[PDB]
Amino acid sequence: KEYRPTLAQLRTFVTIAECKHFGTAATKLSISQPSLSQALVALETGLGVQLIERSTRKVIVTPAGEKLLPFAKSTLDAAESFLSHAKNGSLTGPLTVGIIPTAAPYILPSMLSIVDEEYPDLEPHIVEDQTKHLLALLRDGAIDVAMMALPSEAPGMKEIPLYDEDFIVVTASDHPFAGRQDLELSALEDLDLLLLDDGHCLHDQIVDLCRTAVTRASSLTTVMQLVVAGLGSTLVPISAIPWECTRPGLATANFNSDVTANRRIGLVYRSSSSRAEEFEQFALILQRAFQEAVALAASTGITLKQNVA
Amino acid sequence: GSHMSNKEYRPTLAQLRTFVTIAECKHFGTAATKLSISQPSLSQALVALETGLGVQLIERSTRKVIVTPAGEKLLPFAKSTLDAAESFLSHAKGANGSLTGPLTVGIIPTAAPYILPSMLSIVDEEYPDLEPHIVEDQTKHLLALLRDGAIDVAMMALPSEAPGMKEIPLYDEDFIVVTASDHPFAGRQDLELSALEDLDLLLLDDGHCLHDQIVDLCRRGNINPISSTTAVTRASSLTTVMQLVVAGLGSTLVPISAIPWECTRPGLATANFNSDVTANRRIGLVYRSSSSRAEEFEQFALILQRAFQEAVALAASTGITLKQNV
Amino acid sequence: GSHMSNKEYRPTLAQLRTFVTIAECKHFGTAATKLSISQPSLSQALVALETGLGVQLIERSTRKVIVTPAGEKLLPFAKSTLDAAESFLSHAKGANGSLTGPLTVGIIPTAAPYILPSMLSIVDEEYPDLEPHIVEDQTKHLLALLRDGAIDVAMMALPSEAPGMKEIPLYDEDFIVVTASDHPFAGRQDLELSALEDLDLLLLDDGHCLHDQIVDLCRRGNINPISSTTAVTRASSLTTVMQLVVAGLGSTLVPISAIPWECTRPGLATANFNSDVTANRRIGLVYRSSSSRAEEFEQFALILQRAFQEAVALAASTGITLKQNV
Amino acid sequence: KEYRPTLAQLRTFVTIAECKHFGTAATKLSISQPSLSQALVALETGLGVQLIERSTRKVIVTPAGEKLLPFAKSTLDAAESFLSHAKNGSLTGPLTVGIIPTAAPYILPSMLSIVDEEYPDLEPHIVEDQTKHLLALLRDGAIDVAMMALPSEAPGMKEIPLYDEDFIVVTASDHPFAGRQDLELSALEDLDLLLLDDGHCLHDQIVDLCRTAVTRASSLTTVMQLVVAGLGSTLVPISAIPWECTRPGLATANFNSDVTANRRIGLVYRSSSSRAEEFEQFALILQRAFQEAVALAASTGITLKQNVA
Ligand code: NA
Ligand code: NA
Ligand code: NI
Ligand code: NI
């Protein structure tokens, strides 16, 4: 035959060999004495090896059996180990998170601190990269969830909204809009805007736009350099204010209440995942992290955008 | 949720084999073909496993399979369960007794001397109809001979990276550090990879694999990341190196099987890397994939494993302190 | 011997060019063709050099040329002599003034912010008819744009390993180590490669090349030998990394040009590797080999070199201690 | 033109720029004042740049010249550096030596010690490998010289003989030839010889031969293992006696005076090399190293082969 032993057969062998009685062994395995015998005989017939000698009062392991016993035992130990590691509505184990570059720096320390202090069994793994790369990794299973601007517009993905994050206007210190808090969308025409692909959504009740020597930057650092040097102005998410907007050479302004200038940040994951509940719990952490970043921005004394509604 | 872990459930080997195959193939079609079962029954077995455990192991899309993080964590445990079962079966063919006739074995020079007496003794006593022929030579020569049929099997460091071959893993063999008696690291048992800078290591092409959790000096991408800073650019023999170590012109790494023969003479001391450092080699048996003698070679592998275990106990019996691992 | 060194002899650049070409080509035929001279006159020039010096540089066989050990030792010195002469000529075309019209430049994110203001200032003041267009993005994007003609030149870490490109080397840029204020290595200026184990380095794909005389962690054979032991598997931005460093969750490497902008805020300290450690990157200009604008690009390279020199002086003026090299 | 400046032209420029007079400059360069002028004008015409202004009493470097001066100066410094590093019937600088595996271990420490103490400017580099590999490296210039058994029989190579090295017979302790010093070549038929490809040459006046489970070994260690275990006997070069033949489980024997059992060790190098004199000087070191190894062998108290002639 092309016989392969089963774990139940191996369990019968190991138990008999250690108990040295059929009665004791069958009771320890919660099976009948005929079934115990059947499984042993199936094993000995499959192998072509007598493992156990049976007498009236006692059982003896053959020399062939003593040689094979440690190997059967390691097989059962590994199976028990598999089961033990396979062991409930909570954030535990590995969680691999993609985060876009214009969000990551400003919330990552809060998020990691909260996980370390309050979710001690969670094992977070963070990948920071551009939206398109994050979605490719998500699709291929190299990350579990991606924190990014919504809508994702990615097939087969589900979205959990986290928060709306306002932008602030950042100019050179000497720019005539320095300190203004009532700008209209028309004010855009008077700035040499260098914008990043950061999910910004700009509109008011009439105009919808939610649709320099440097053609395009991928980093806010390149942009801020140009702004300090007087060659441009830009939009910065408010979470980045403490880190990016407090150095000399910069000033800030804001649009009026009637202008929307924000981005919708969300968690995106594969529809095929069973982990929706874990991701929702993780969302709560990210919302807190953002609120901590917002309070840090407010504590700089820089005036933040005011909104209606 | 109310569809979590099933208490009386125990996974079967067939269920574990379905899991491992899907996880490695990443398609249901190629997995079912490899297991010679239907695509519905593959699915049935996997769902039985996932329902028993209360854990999603695989995510299913139209074109694609993805192993979940829970699945990746459990994959090595399923694999060890199957490996132990295959090991049991392999040792149960001690009755089969297929090791007869001529067997020509290539063995690398930093392994052969230290396991050859055990292996030949075991063959002579327990496999009296086996007719062993041993060729001891450098890796490249052994592979040319293997390729051309002049040897049947080669015992060497894995990966072999040889076209047309199969590999049977035998064992991981640690190295010990060997210095001159006067070297400042003599006697240390907690050396880190940084110790390389002050060891003056003269290394052989002996399969050594050195790394810790942060730095990898192994992955031999056709360029050796450890350089020598000594008058000896390149040594091909351990005896040349040990002579240089006794003379105070460097230190080296020696396989633990070689300790009784090489590391007990005057002028030498030994040291070891710490638990967190890997400093070992993967020894394997390599043969031509077309061979009808796979089962004989697997039986021969078991003999080599015993021979190595005997060499390790001989090393231990010298009283020299060996590498500890986690 | 009585056919040793000639006292009044001075080597000429043409003689040195004959030597370097033969040494690299290893045939007289391909060397003479590359220099557009006859095979006899190539030989004549080499023999004039060897007779002047009293040193055999090349051994001649029928099929083969071999550079002598004396020759291998002198080869980098001949090469630096020719490079300096080419540099002189390249700077003498400051009068030529070929940098006009549109020039679209790709620059990697860990270089662009720190040299962009200098470069644009120099262009605006001294090359008023040049019309620069800057694209700042990750290496792979820049190379796709370069390949497709959407940019003319890319400023990036060498080697580029991009098909169809030429490279102009610009400069080697050292890194500085950046830690949290409380890190035990804060302030050190003598760190060895072993310090990696206790730094918790979060590294970017920024061209960093780390090695000393014994260990090479650079040679990126499509597999990163330094691993991270942190919650952050992979960061693509320096700002993410610096935030993590301030928060005490790791250390990093920062190009020295970025010191004024990135390394002067509270919560950070700096350190450096010792003289014997290399921790730098080779920055170069990469362009399509078919281009008729090679001379314009070489002139643009000189501007970038000045911009970098200005960024290094800005870094120096902060009072932060920079890496020393041998 | 496709003009390239010459070093002489650059030297004229740098000298004038530093001296600030044509007379002083021409004298410092040991050339005529017309020749100095000619070289400068050739440089300025080739470049299309005036580097020097000439007045009656004085010379002034133009702004274009001041900019170019450091580059000319580095060109001349590099040329002077080349010449300085290019600088006599002695063993100095790099010497890359191939040595066969059955010779290397037993002479390498003496040789390196002698070089380090007595030839402080020599920079030795040692490659130890099999004869065929050494010859491939020699041919390709990756080594300068190979220490090996003669004849090499390699095309285009020259040989320097170093010494004849005797072999000793090594058996298991219990072998009936233990301690014998008068063996004939016929004694070979009574040993299960495992021999290495080590250049051994065996003959007497009548028979010329100079022409186990282990089919073949490349290492003496594999062979000695088999000899201690009683499965073979072998031949060992006398230089290896202290290291290889003093452990328990071994005994030694020798052939009689009328038997030759030796190997001719030599240095082999490419005919195309000009370094014969250096190699001859290196040969003297190797001869001493071998004589030290021979005295070490003798000091073990093991009886060495006696020869006629
Ligand atoms: Na994990
Ligand atoms: Na050298
Ligand atoms: Ni991309
Ligand atoms: Ni070979």
Q: Three-state SS across chain C?
A: CCCCCCCCCCCCHHHHHHHHHHHHHCCHHHHHHHCCCCHHHHHHHHHHHHHHHCCCCEEECCCCEEECHHHHHHHHHHHHHHHHHHHHHHHHCCCCCCCCEEEEEEECCCCHHHHHHHHHHHHHHHCCCEEEEEEECCHHHHHHHHHCCCCCEEEEEECCCCCCEEEEEEEEEEEEEEEECCCCCCCCCCECHHHHHHCCECCCCCCCEEECCCEECCCCCCCCCECCCCCEEECCCHHHHHHHHHCCCCEEEEEHHHHHHHCCCCCEEEECECCCCEEEEEEEEEEECCCCCHHHHHHHHHHHHHHHHHHHHHHHHCCCCCCCCC
User: How far is D218 from B240, CA to CA, in rounded Å?
Assistant: 14
Cα separation, B149 vs B137, whole angstroms: 15
Q: Which helix (H) or strand (E) holds A295?
A: helix A276-299
Q: In Å, what is the CA distance from A305 to each residue of A169, A257, C7?
A: 9, 8, 81
Residue B223, phi then psi, degrees to nearest 5: -170, 125
What does the DSSP assignment read for chain D?
------HHHHHHHHHHHHH-SHHHHHHHTTS-HHHHHHHHHHHHHHHT---EEE-SS-EEE-HHHHHHHHHHHHHHHHHHHHHHHH---S--EEEEEEE-TTTHHHHHHHHHHHHHHH-TTEEEEEEE--HHHHHHHHHTTS-SEEEEESP---TTEEEEEEEEEEEEEEEETTSTTTT-S-B-GGGGGGS-B---SS--EEE-SS-B-----EEE-S-HHHHHHHHHTTS-BEEEEGGGHHHHSSSTTEEEE-B-TT-EEEEEEEEEEETT-S-HHHHHHHHHHHHHHHHHHHHHHHHTTPPPPP---
Query: Residue C324's CB: how many other CB atoms inside 10 A?
Result: 12
The token duo for C87 is 């540099």
Q: Are C36 and C74 in contact (CB under 8 A)?
A: no
Structure tokens, C231: 């919650």
Q: Which residues of B touch C192 (CB under 8 A)?
A: 194, 197
Burial of B146 (0-12, 13-18, 19+ CB in 10 A): buried
Alpha-carbon gap, residue C86 to C294, rounded angstroms: 14
The vertex-A141 CA angle with A140 and A146, nearest 5°, equals 100
Determine the Cα–Cα distance for residues B73 and C62; give it in Å rounded to an integer: 62
Which residue on chain A is closest to C102 by alpha carbon?
A213
The residues, any chain, with a CB within 8 Å of residue B161's CB and separated by 6 or more, are: none
For the record, the structure tokens of C216 come out as 């090479």
Closest chain C residue to the Cα of B277, Cα to Cα: C197
When scoring D215, D231, D245 by the number of chain B Cβ atoms within 10 A, the one with the most, hence best to mutate, is D215
Which of A176, A210, A172 has its CA nearest to residue A190? A176
- The torsion of the CA quartet B92, B94, B96, B100, rounded to 10 degrees, works out to 150
CA distance C176 to C259: 8
CA of A139 to the centre of ligand 3 (A): 15
- B104-131 b/e (C-beta count within 10 Å ≥ 16 → b): bbbbbbbbbbbbbbbbbebbeeebeebe
Residue C68's region, left for phi above 0, alpha for psi from -120 to 50, else beta, is: beta
CB D184 within 8 A of CB D255: yes
Q: Do A286 and A111 touch, CB atoms closer than 8 A?
A: yes
B221 CA from centroid of ligand 4 (Å): 21
- Taking an 8 Å cut-off on Cβ atoms, the answer to whether C215 and B213 are in contact is no
A183-191 long-range CB contacts below 8 Å, 24 or more apart? A183/A253, A183/A254, A183/A255, A183/A256, A183/A259, A184/A255, A184/A256, A184/A258, A184/A259, A185/A209, A185/A255, A185/A259, A187/A255, A191/A232, A191/A233
Q: What is the spatial distance between Cα C112 and Cα C261, in angstroms, rounded to a whole number?
A: 12
Q: How far apart are CA C201 and CA C226, in angstroms?
A: 9
Q: Are A132 and C144 spatial neighbours (Cβ–Cβ below 8 Å)?
A: no
Nearest-by-CA chain C residue for A244: C239
Chain centre to alpha carbon of residue B285: 10
Calculate ∠ Cα A292-A278-A98, nearest 5°.
65
What are C247's two structure tokens? 């928060």
**Cβ neighbours of residue C295 under 8 Å, at least 6 residues apart?**
C93, C96, C98
- Minimal Cα–Cα distance from C30 to chain A, Å? 45
Positive or negative torsion for Cα B103, B104, B106, B112: positive
For residues B131 and C162, give the distance between their C-alpha atoms in angstroms, rounded to a whole number: 56
Interchain CB contact of A126 with C (< 8 Å):
yes
Strands B153-158 and B101-107: parallel
Distance CA C13, CA C276 (A): 33
**Domain interval for residue C29:** 18-93
Residues C115, C304 contacting (CB under 8 angstroms) = yes
Chain D residues with CB under 8 Å of C70 CB are 86, 93
Of the candidates C112, C304, C318, the one whose C-alpha atom is nearest the C-alpha of residue A220 is C112
Strand bridging mode C165-180 / C278-288: antiparallel
Query: Pick from A253, A278, A94, A231: which is nearest to A177 by CA?
Result: A253
CATH number of the domain enclosing B249: 3.40.190.10
Sign of CA dihedral B6, B73, A287, A100: negative
| Structure obtained using | X-ray
From CA C24, how far away is CA C13, in angstroms rounded?
16
CA dihedral sign, ordered B257, B262, B264, B268: negative
Q: Does B59 touch chain A (CB under 8 A)?
A: yes
Chains A and D touch, using 3 or more CB pairs below 8 Å: no
CB contact under 8 A, A141 and B1: no
Q: In terms of Cα–Cα distance, which of C240, C315, C219, C237 is closest to C270?
A: C315
| DSSP H or E segment with residue A98 | strand A93-99
Cα–Cα distance for residue pair A115/A117, rounded to 1 Å: 6
Tell me whether residue C26 is exposed, middle or buried, using C-beta atoms within 10 angstroms of its C-beta: 0 to 12, 13 to 18, 19 or more. middle
Measured in whole angstroms, the distance separating CA A110 from the mean position of its chain's CA atoms is 15
- In chain A, what's the furthest Cα-to-Cα distance? 105
Ligand nearest to the CA of C138: 3
Looking at the CA of B144, name the nearest ligand: 4
Q: Which residues pair with A165 in a beta bridge?
A: A263
Q: Which residues of C208-221 are buried (b: 16+ CB within 10 A; e: fewer)?
A: bbbbbebbbbbeee
Query: What count of Cα atoms within 13 Å lies in the side-chain half-sphere of residue B120?
Result: 20
| DSSP 8-state symbol, B159 | P
Residue D186 CB partners (closer than 8 Å, separation 6+) = none
Chain B residue numbers touching C223 (CB-CB < 8 A) = 216, 219, 221
C-alpha B185/C-alpha B179 separation (Å) is 8
Separation of CA C65 and ligand 2 centre (Å)? 21
Task: Answer whether A145's CB lies under 8 Å from A138's CB.
Answer: yes
Give Dmax over CA atoms of chain B in angstroms. Answer: 72
Residue of D nearest to B231 (CA): D125
Mapped onto helix, strand or coil, the DSSP state of residue B134 is strand
Owner of token pair 């010329």? D208
Mutate to test the interface with C, among A106, A128, A131 (most CBs of C within 10 A): A128
Residue of A nearest to B78 (CA): A82
Burial (CB count <10 Å: 0-12, 13-18, 19+), residue C97: exposed
DSSP string, D45-96: HHHT---EEE-SS-EEE-HHHHHHHHHHHHHHHHHHHHHHHH---S--EEEE
Residue numbers in C near D43 (CB within 8 A): none
Q: Identify the bridge partners of residue C279 per DSSP, sorted by sequence position.
A: C210
- DSSP class of residue B206 equals S
Residue in the block written with tokens 């050990």: C69
Chain A neighbors of C242, CB-CB under 8 A = 105
**Residues found in chain C:** 326
Angle at C189 between CA C187 and CA C194, to 5 degrees: 105
Neighbours of C185 (CB within 10 A): 17
Report d(CA A101, CA B321) in Å as an integer: 51
Query: What is the DSSP secondary structure assignment for residue B273, as one 8-state letter?
Result: B
Q: Which ligand is nearest to the CA of D126?
A: 2
C137 to chain A: which residues are within 8 Å by CB?
Answer: 216-218
C-alpha to C-alpha distance for D141 and D135, rounded to whole angstroms: 10
Contact B125/C at CB under 8 A: no
- Picking from B323, B296, B320, B277, the residue whose alpha carbon sits closest to that of residue B129 is B296
Cβ-nearest to B69 among A47, A74, A94: A94
Instruction: Tell me how far apart the alpha carbons of residues D217 and D21 are, in angstroms, rounded to a whole number.
Output: 78
d(CA A302, CA A305): 10
C-alpha distances in angstroms, C108 versus A219, C123, C285, C286? 10, 19, 11, 12
**How many residues in chain B?**
326
- DSSP H or E segment with residue A158: strand A157-172
Asked whether the beta carbons of D107 and D290 are under 8 A apart, the reply is yes
Contacting residues of A for C234, CB less than 8 Å apart? 126-129
The CATH number that applies at residue A29 is 1.10.10.10
Q: Provide the β-strand partners of residue D99.
A: D128, D147
Q: What residues form DSSP beta bridges with A169?
A: A235, A253
Counted across chains B and D, CB pairs separated by less than 8 A come out at 104
Chains C and D touch (3+ CB pairs under 8 A): yes
> Residue holding tokens 């320097």?
D160
- Taking the C-alpha atoms of residue D290 and residue D296, their distance in angstroms, rounded to an integer, is 10
**With contact defined as beta carbons under 8 Å apart, do B201 and B210 qualify?**
no
Query: Quick one: tokens of B109?
Result: 């020079």
Burial class (CB in 10 A: 0-12, 13-18, 19+), A148: buried
Residue D126 sits at the chain B interface (C-beta within 8 Å)? yes
Angle between helices A104-118 and C238-246 (to 10 degrees): 40
B61 → closest Cβ in A6, A68, A272: A272
Beta strands A234-237 and A122-128 are unpaired
> Which two three-digit tokens encode residue A87?
């062991």
Give dist(CA B280, CA B261) in Å, integer.
19
Q: Is C55 on the interface with B (CB under 8 A)?
A: no
In this structure, what token pair is assigned to residue B266?
């005057």
DSSP string computed for D124-141: EEEEE--HHHHHHHHHTT
Q: Which tokens sit at C152?
A: 């003319």
Q: Length of chain D, please? A: 309
Q: How many CB pairs under 8 A join A and B?
A: 100
Q: Is B212 helix (H, G, I), strand (E, B) or coil?
A: coil
- D93 CA → ligand 2 middle, Å: 6
Q: How many CA atoms lie within 13 A of D180 on its CB side?
A: 15
Query: Which residue numbers come right before each break in chain A (C to N over 2.5 Å)?
Result: 87, 211
Buried b or exposed e, range D256-294, using 16+ CB within 10 angstroms = beebbbbbbbbbbbbebbebeebbebbbebbeebbebbb
**CB contact set of D126 (below 8 Å; sequence gap of 6+):** B231, B232, B233, B234, B235, D96, D97, D99, D104, D108, D112
d(CA C318, CA B195): 36
Could you tell me which residues come within 8 angstroms of residue B299 by beta carbon, excluding any fewer than 6 positions away? B93, B96, B98, B99
Amino acid present at D68:
L
Of the bound ligands, which one is closest to the alpha carbon of residue C145? 3
CB count within 10 Å of CB C248 equals 16
The C-alpha atoms of residue D124 and residue B233 are separated, in whole angstroms, by 9
Is the peptide bond preceding residue A151 cis, with omega within 30 degrees of 0? yes
Sequence letter at residue B162: A
**Residues A267 and A286 sit within 8 Å (Cβ to Cβ):** yes
User: Where are any strands of DSSP class E within B58-149?
Assistant: 58-60, 65-67, 101-107, 130-136
The answer to whether C215 and B216 have CB atoms below 8 angstroms apart is no
Query: Strands C165-180 and C101-107, how do they pair?
Result: unpaired
Grouping H, G, I as helix, E, B as strand and the rest as coil, residue A70 is helix
Amino acid at position A156, single letter: G
Long-range CB contacts for residues C93-96, cutoff 8 Å, separation at least 24: C93/C295, C93/C299, C94/D64, C94/D67, C95/D48, C95/D49, C95/D64, C96/C295, C96/C299
- The number of angstroms, rounded, from the C-alpha of B7 to the middle of its chain's C-alpha atoms is 37
- Is the preceding peptide bond at C159 cis, omega within 30 degrees of 0? yes
What is the Cβ-side half-sphere exposure of residue B262, based on CA atoms within 13 angstroms? 31
Cβ–Cβ under 8 Å, residues D267 and D150: no
User: Residue D147 contacts by C-beta under 8 Å, 6 or more apart in sequence?
Assistant: D97, D98, D99, D100, D103, D104, D162, D265, D266, D267, D286
Angle of helix A7-19 relative to helix A33-47, nearest 10 degrees?
110
